[PDB]
Design a binder for this molecule. Structure first.
Ligand SMILES: Nc1ncnc2c1ncn2[C@@H]1O[C@H](COP(=O)(O)OP(=O)(O)OP(=O)(O)O)[C@@H](O)[C@H]1O
Ligand SMILES: Nc1ncnc2c1ncn2[C@@H]1O[C@H](COP(=O)(O)OP(=O)(O)O)[C@@H](O)[C@H]1O
Ligand SMILES: Nc1ncnc2c1ncn2[C@@H]1O[C@H](COP(=O)(O)OP(=O)(O)O)[C@@H](O)[C@H]1O
Ligand SMILES: [Mg+2]
Ligand SMILES: [Mg+2]
Ligand SMILES: [Mg+2]
Lengths: 387, 400, 172, 370, 151
């Protein structure tokens, strides 16, 4: 294929993988590992299950598997299962020998140091990569825009994180985590459907409500209007057929599920939701740069894909500036400019930006942490990878 | 509000407990069952309820339980059950009295709406409080009504006939994000006892005989492979139960491993169900570990038991030891990383003299409060807004 | 959860397909390595766990020792189907006839052909059959010492009740 | 008795003039329940303050009505003042004249609304609103000094000589214990610990008060922490869970000397103090170096006085005798100084009375108070 | 809290009805005079027993506008009074000789009549509705749905 640097978005819900200059993931698959189970469920001779089965091999066959996730909240929870994802990623998805290759990895901005350390150790000491770079996921989503300033908010399966950038300087003191994302919204959909008498407690059923959420949920633009369509009308009602063949009815849960991003208290969090987390972040930036951050609020990651989320977010920031800056005086509201950037490709902006950055540093061999540098400095070799 | 005593109705899946605020017991405790017929039309007058419905199966009435898995699902039958509760048993006029009702924490907005229109339009009650049921069961746990005896923080495990739910409450506030429910309770352990009598082809496997074998013969063991082995090692572990048939003759039933294997439904729900898998000690851990960090000692220090299906011999001791194992293994993982011993946490599971009817006794104690009539919907609220007044969830966080 | 084989803690065990040919106490002829007569082996484990395990409806397999315990668990359900109303002597001859008669191995009408591997060579199939025939003859002979423990001319009802408790909804 | 109330940006301190410690000291917090699920008639209410807000905190959202020394919420600050009078001191405030405290370089509207609420809602006979740093000087038995006060929301330097303040040389920094607690909640994420609720903020403040310290030489303590666990300590969470903390113990307080750790463009407290004395005239510059008074709870760290001394002696010329004055009571010194001032004979003519407030309105506080 | 503050009503002004429908090219007193010339002809045609010519003349002009409710209601009073005085056997012969624009005006003003039964007799308006829709088809109601809001 090519001698290029490999780029790997080892995300909490999905792995995405490919090479420098790729305009889209070469492969993308669930970051899941499966073990064989029997469960008072259908069985046939038309398949065979190995003692470890992962990614697409697990997701297509998950009725037969104990499904587990090697990651949660942007951190590796189990490196023994993460080793099985990385084996699968290199040896039977890419079908590559890692020996002496250079690889670009990704993580969110406020992880434990042990996550990056043991992840780089694994690249040098299981796979024998010749060099590694680890990039902050949301600065890659800005490389995908071809853009040097704006506040970039990335919401995936594990974490929602925000990174203000101005004139290519990253405002590291302003970066933050909202510990609500696509998995919390999926756990909330299970909780809301449980009030309707449905049950989804099997490890294989989490991917079923993920696909249901991803098909049927949307962000209410106006809560009292969606509550009116919900309580006065049947128009929000929708049928979903599970891979069982069972049919379930879903109504208010379609707007009530993703509302936990804009109202985290619905999932028990005390943090402010997306609009107020983004506003408190921009409003903490210096006076001379606030306008440039409001004129480029860059959305990223799969949990930014709910229908109406850009519309609600733009409105709710105008509405929050009107409360907290103008104190309810209409006369200056038309002068406040905000622009949500909401590209079609934005679920993959971290990969697409990693494929840009990995090309920009492909020839600059000193930019990567080397295997020869790792084996003499250990974890102190990673002090190259920013502050 | 009126100066007349509030009327307390805990309508469970198995049993309805009916009475007046401030009494030392419910006035009635009888099954939540209706017996119905299956030139003027009067077949909606001809029904019976409770103990008097159980007497009517031989007279050709069809019995039904209008509450199943904690939720009302037949509003015709629940309206007739309430009118007969009010006018036969409680012998009261709704226009003179305020009512305390109950339902599970999950229960649909639709159920509280349907409940309010029957109470305010069919019966025309003066006012209605629909209580969060296991929050009342915390208040029944006090040693006396005096403020110095109150323990406003505790986990409550309620297990009745139809559903079991674990509720964290702290400083008197319900942490609704942390509610856990297991869809299995006292009826599913009866269907399991019944299924085991039926697998042995015993002379009787009627539902009353499987029920009576739970109440009298069943208990919670430490471990079912050790207890199966004890039923080889010791011979008087098998009991003989004498039962009388529907057509009025004697029978004798050998009762065996269902004595320990049937209460194991709570500690291994993979025995009961394909659809629920997490055992009750792990499910109580998930309630306290999802709950805010400053209330976790208080929630483990006071795990109140509630509802009839928590009364199995050795149940609270199995829950306490298995949860203490989960809790200390999690604390020791942290001591072994840090190189310093903790203070630990005491896990206390609390069984108490009012445990059988803790929701009703709590409802009685809370309806005695001077403020109570201000927490009710009054019929004057219902005349303005209708049944929509009761629709909003009390226990969970609402959008809007 | 359900109970798994203590012999999953063993290592470098002989194997065919992905059955473990575990150490076995027996007097029947075949390939299985003689266990210690003083210690529990997989058949003392398989019968001791069976009447708990047959109630669970979810089971995750840790390795080839559990694949062996499952095949035994399914064969105890077959034996308790075959045994009913017999004298102990008639039951020994009926359940040896059941153990000996031609059965499907994994890789052939086998009920769990997704969870078990086919035999790794044309010769691995013969060692898998000659192990499974010896195992299930011993498993039949050992079960009868429990179901005819207290009386000898009728099978104990405290064992015959599991005859319809179909483990994980699977049967041979 | 006059009352003395220190309007602490994180910690209210209240008592009677001529007493030698606060009668009451408590969090400047109002807490509100984050759950609508309730027990009827059960002693259960719309807001909690002070020690009720701390003891109930797991189910509350906690907010301080003061941020950076400025009252941002007046409806909750009047609950805090109501609680100081009617619940902590157990007095009717209309019987007692009240000394209040203020930070230098605050909004004038803060001091106007603070005199207005005291006469118009608490009905006091008389009141006064002193700058905190001159009270901390009067608490220490001296008329010359440069006072480094450091509370929850503000830190400020006031040069004062022969009882005359030098207001052109005053420095103020919007960095103190709130910002150090924020930065500790931030850097504890690197150990893998997530603290995000307004209740967990109070746990991390307790970690900070119990275990954090000022490094005497920071890059040597960093090299020490990289070499050994002898620097690491353990903390018992309210969960019974054990937390381990290492270089975060001294990286947290280093922010006070290196504000750029939180992205803030400022001099650290050494350079701020140096530039404050260096902005005073050369004859006074001889003396205040021997009288660097430290005040407020953010000056309470282990090692802070020795490192404040080793830093300020590298900026000052080598002929100077430098002293850091850091009493063990420094947490309360602005209150102890207010207790002294409200007890002085010559102070009784310079209160603001209810009569001259009725004759002038709330703008009178700018002609009566420094 | 911020969620309830209407920002859209001031940051994105929506289309008005006069952006969809063209402005009336006549003043309020100019249309009020034009109708005040027609109502006496419509009344007079009832007294001579020529109520069919009473409608044909009244229908030659129609008032519209949110500034003219008084003269619109006076025109509707005359319209319902004229329709109430035409014999039910004359309706089929009259409807088939109306233009598509006269039919559109008849079905529009029977709709304004049906909206106010305490003033207007619905029984004759429903009889006119049956016959106008039977002869001219469904499209005449479709033209009323699509019609201007200040008719
Ligand atoms: N159209 C959609 N509507 C709603 N949710 C979506 C949609 N598309 C994807 N998601 C959700 O986004 C999540 C996956 O997004 P993404 O790949 O960006 O996460 P990730 O990178 O793996 O996670 P993280 O960045 O936190 O480590 C899943 O929860 C998925 O269901
Ligand atoms: N001593 C007991 N031991 C075990 N279960 C019991 C005992 N006494 C009653 N039960 C069971 O408790 C259940 C009824 O409990 P209850 O709290 O009244 O349920 P519910 O409120 O949901 O109707 C029934 O399944 C009943 O058989
Ligand atoms: N021993 C200590 N070591 C470090 N910080 C302390 C110590 N004691 C208190 N603090 C800090 O003191 C601050 C409160 O100081 P205080 O002088 O009372 O401020 P304020 O008057 O403005 O409310 C809190 O942020 C607290 O974390
Ligand atoms: Mg991602
Ligand atoms: Mg119940
Ligand atoms: Mg202070």
């Amino acid at each position: 294929m090519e001698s290029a640097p490999i780029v790997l978005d080892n995300g909490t819900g999905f792995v995405k993988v490919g090479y420098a200059k790729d305009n889209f993931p070469r492969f993308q698959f669930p970051s899941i590992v499966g073990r064989p189970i029997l469960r008072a469920e259908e069985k046939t001779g038309n398949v065979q299950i190995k003692d470890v089965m992962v990614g697409d091999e697990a997701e297509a066959v998950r009725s037969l598997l104990q499904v587990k996730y090697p990651m949660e909240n942007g951190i590796i929870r189990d490196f023994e299962e993460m080793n099985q994802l990385w084996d699968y990623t290199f040896f039977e998805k890419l079908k590559i020998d890692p020996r002496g290759r250079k690889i670009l990895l990704t993580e969110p901005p406020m992880n434990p140091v042990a996550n990056r350390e043991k992840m780089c150790e694994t690249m040098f000491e299981r796979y024998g990569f010749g060099g590694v770079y680890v990039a902050i996921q949301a600065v890659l989503s800005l490389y995908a825009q071809g853009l040097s300033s704006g506040v970039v908010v990335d919401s995936g399966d594990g974490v929602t994180h925000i990174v203000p950038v101005y004139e290519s300087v990253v405002l590291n003191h302003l970066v933050g985590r909202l510990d609500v994302a696509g998995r919390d919204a999926t756990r909330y959909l299970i909780s809301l459907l449980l009030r309707k008498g449905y049950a989804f407690n099997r490890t294989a059923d989490f991917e079923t409500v993920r696909e249901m959420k991803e098909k049927l949920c949307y962000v209410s633009y106006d809560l009292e209007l969606d509550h009116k369509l919900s309580e006065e009308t049947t128009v929000l009602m929708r049928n979903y057929t599970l891979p069982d063949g069972r049919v379930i009815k879903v109504g208010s849960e379609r707007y009530e599920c993703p509302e936990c991003l804009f109202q985290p208290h619905l999932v028990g969090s005390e943090q402010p939701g997306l609009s107020e987390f983004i506003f408190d972040t921009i409003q903490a930036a210096d006076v001379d740069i606030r306008k440039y951050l409001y004129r480029a609020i860059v959305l990223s990651g799969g949990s930014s894909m709910y229908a109406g989320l850009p519309s609600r977010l733009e409105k709710e920031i105008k509405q929050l500036w009107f409360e907290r800056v103008l104190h309810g005086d209409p006369a200056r509201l038309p002068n406040f400019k905000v622009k949500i950037e909401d590209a079609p490709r934005r679920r993959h902006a971290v990969f697409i930006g990693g494929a840009v950055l990995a090309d920009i540093m492909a020839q600059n061999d000193h930019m990567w942490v080397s295997k020869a540098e790792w084996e003499e400095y250990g974890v102190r070799a990673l002090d190259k990878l920013g502050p | 509000a009126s100066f007349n005593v509030p009327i307390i109705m805990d309508n469970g899946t198995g049993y309805s407990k009916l009475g007046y605020a401030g009494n030392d017991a419910p006035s009635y405790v009888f099954p939540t069952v209706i017996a119905t017929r299956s030139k003027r039309a009067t077949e909606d007058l001809d029904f019976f309820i409770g103990n008097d419905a159980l007497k009517k199966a031989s007279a050709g009435y069809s019995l039904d339980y209008p509450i199943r898995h904690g939720q009302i699902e037949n509003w015709d039958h629940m309206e007739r059950f309430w009118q007969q509760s009010l006018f036969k048993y409680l012998r009261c006029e709704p226009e003179d009295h305020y009512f305390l009702l109950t339902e599970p924490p999950l229960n649909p907005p639709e159920n509280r709406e349907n409940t309010a229109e029957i109470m305010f339009e069919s019966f025309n009650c003066a006012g209605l409080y629909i209580a969060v049921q296991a929050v009342l069961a915390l208040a029944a746990s006090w040693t006396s009504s005096k403020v110095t005896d109150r323990s406003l923080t505790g986990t409550v495990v309620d297990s009745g006939d139809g559903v079991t739910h674990i509720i964290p409450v702290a400083e008197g506030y319900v942490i609704g994000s942390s509610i856990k429910t297991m869809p299995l309770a006292g009826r599913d352990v009866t269907y399991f006892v019944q299924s085991l009598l039926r697998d042995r082809n015993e002379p009787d496997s009627s539902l009353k005989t499987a029920e009576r074998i739970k109440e009298e013969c069943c208990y919670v063991c430490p471990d079912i492979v050790k207890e199966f082995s004890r039923f080889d090692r010791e011979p008087d572990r098998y009991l003989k139960y004498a039962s009388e048939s529907i057509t009025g003759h004697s029978t004798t039933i050998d009762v065996g491993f269902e004595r320990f294997l049937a209460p194991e439904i709570f500690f291994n729900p993979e025995i009961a169900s394909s659809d629920f898998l997490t055992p009750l000690p792990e499910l109580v851990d998930n309630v306290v570990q999802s709950s805010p960090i400053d209330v976790r000692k208080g929630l483990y220090k006071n795990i109140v038991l509630s509802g009839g299906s928590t009364l199995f011999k050795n149940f609270g001791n199995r829950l306490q030891r298995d949860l203490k194992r989960i809790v200390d293994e999690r604390i020791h993982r942290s001591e072994m990383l840090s190189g310093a011993k903790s203070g630990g946490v005491d896990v206390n599971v609390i069984s108490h003299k009012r445990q059988r009817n803790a929701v009703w006794f709590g409802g009685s104690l809370l309806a005695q409060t001077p403020e109570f009539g201000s927490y009710c919907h009054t019929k004057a609220d219902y005349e303005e807004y209708g049944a929509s007044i009761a629709r909003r969830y009390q226990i969970f966080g609402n959008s809007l | 959860p359900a109970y798994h084989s203590s012999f999953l803690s063993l290592t470098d065990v002989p194997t065919t397909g992905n059955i473990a040919m575990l150490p076995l106490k027996t007097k029947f002829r075949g390939p299985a390595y003689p266990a210690d007569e003083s210690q529990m082996d997989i058949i003392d484990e398989c019968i001791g766990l069976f009447r708990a395990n047959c109630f669970f409806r979810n089971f995750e397999i840790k390795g080839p020792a559990d694949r062996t315990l499952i095949y035994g668990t399914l064969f105890i359900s077959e034996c308790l189907g075959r045994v009913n109303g017999l004298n102990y002597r008639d039951a020994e001859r009926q359940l040896n006839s059941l153990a000996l008669e031609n059965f499907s191995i994994p890789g052939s009408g086998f009920p769990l052909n997704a969870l078990y591997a086919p035999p790794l060579s044309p010769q691995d199939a013969e060692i898998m059959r000659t192990y499974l025939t010896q195992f299930r003859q011993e498993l039949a002979y050992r079960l009868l010492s429990h179901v005819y423990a207290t009386e000898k001319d009728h099978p104990s009802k405290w064992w015959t009740c599991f005859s319809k408790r179909r483990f994980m909804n699977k049967a041979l | 008795t006059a009352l003395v109330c220190d309007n602490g940006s994180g910690l209210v301190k209240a008592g009677f003039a001529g007493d030698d410690a606060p009668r009451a000291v408590f969090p400047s917090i109002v807490g509100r329940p984050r759950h609508q699920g309730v027990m009827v008639g059960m002693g259960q209410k719309d807001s909690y303050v002070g020690d009720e807000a701390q003891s109930k905190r797991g189910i509350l959202t906690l907010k301080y009505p003061i941020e950076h020394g400025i009252i941002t919420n007046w409806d909750d600050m009047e609950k805090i003042w109501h609680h100081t009078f009617y619940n902590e001191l157990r007095v009717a405030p209309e019987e007692h004249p009240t000394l209040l405290t203020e930070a230098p370089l605050n909004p004038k509207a803060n001091r106007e609304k603070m005199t207005q609420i005291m006469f118009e809602t608490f009905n006091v006979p008389a009141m006064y609103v002193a700058i905190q740093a001159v009270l901390s000087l009067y608490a220490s038995g001296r008329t010359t000094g440069i006072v480094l006060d450091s509370g929850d929301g503000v830190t400020h330097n006031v040069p004062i000589y022969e009882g005359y303040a030098l207001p052109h040389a005053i420095m103020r920094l919007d960095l103190a214990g709130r910002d150090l607690t924020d930065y500790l909640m931030k850097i504890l994420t690197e150990r893998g610990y997530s603290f995000v609720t307004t209740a967990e903020r109070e746990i991390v403040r307790d970690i900070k008060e119990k275990l954090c310290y000022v490094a005497l030489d920071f890059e040597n303590e960093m090299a020490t922490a990289a070499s050994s666990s002898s620097l690491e300590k353990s903390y018992e969470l309210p969960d019974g869970q054990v937390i381990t903390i290492g270089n975060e113990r001294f990286r947290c307080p280093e922010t006070l000397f290196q504000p750029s750790f939180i992205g803030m463009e400022s001099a650290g407290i050494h350079e701020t103090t140096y530039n404050s004395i260096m902005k005073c005239d050369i004859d006074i510059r001889k003396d205040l170096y021997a009288n660097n008074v430290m005040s407020g709870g953010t000056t309470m760290y282990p090692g802070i006085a020795d490192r404040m001394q080793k830093e300020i002696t590298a900026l000052a010329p080598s002929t100077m005798k430098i002293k850091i004055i850091a009493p063990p009571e420094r947490k309360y010194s602005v209150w102890i100084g207010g207790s002294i001032l409200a007890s002085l004979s010559t102070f009784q003519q310079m209160w603001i009375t209810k009569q001259e407030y009725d004759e002038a309105g709330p703008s009178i506080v700018h002609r009566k108070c420094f | 809290t911020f969620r309830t503050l209407d920002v859209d009503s001031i940051t994105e002004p929506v289309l008005t009805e006069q952006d969809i429908f063209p402005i009336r090219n006549e003043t309020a007193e100019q249309v009020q005079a034009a109708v005040s010339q027609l109502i006496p002809q419509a009344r007079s045609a009832i007294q001579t027993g020529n109520a069919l010519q009473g409608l044909k003349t009244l229908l030659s002009y129609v008032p519209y506008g949110n500034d003219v409710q008084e003269v619109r209601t006076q025109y509707l009073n005359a319209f319902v009074d004229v329709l109430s005085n035409i014999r039910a056997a004359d309706i089929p012969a009259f409807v088939k000789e109306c233009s598509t624009e006269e039919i559109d005006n008849i079905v529009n003003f029977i709709y304004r009549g049906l909206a106010n039964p305490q003033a207007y007799n619905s029984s004759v308006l429903l009889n006119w509705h049956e016959k106008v829709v039977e002869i001219s088809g469904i499209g005449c109601i479709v033209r009323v749905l699509n019609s201007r809001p200040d008719l």
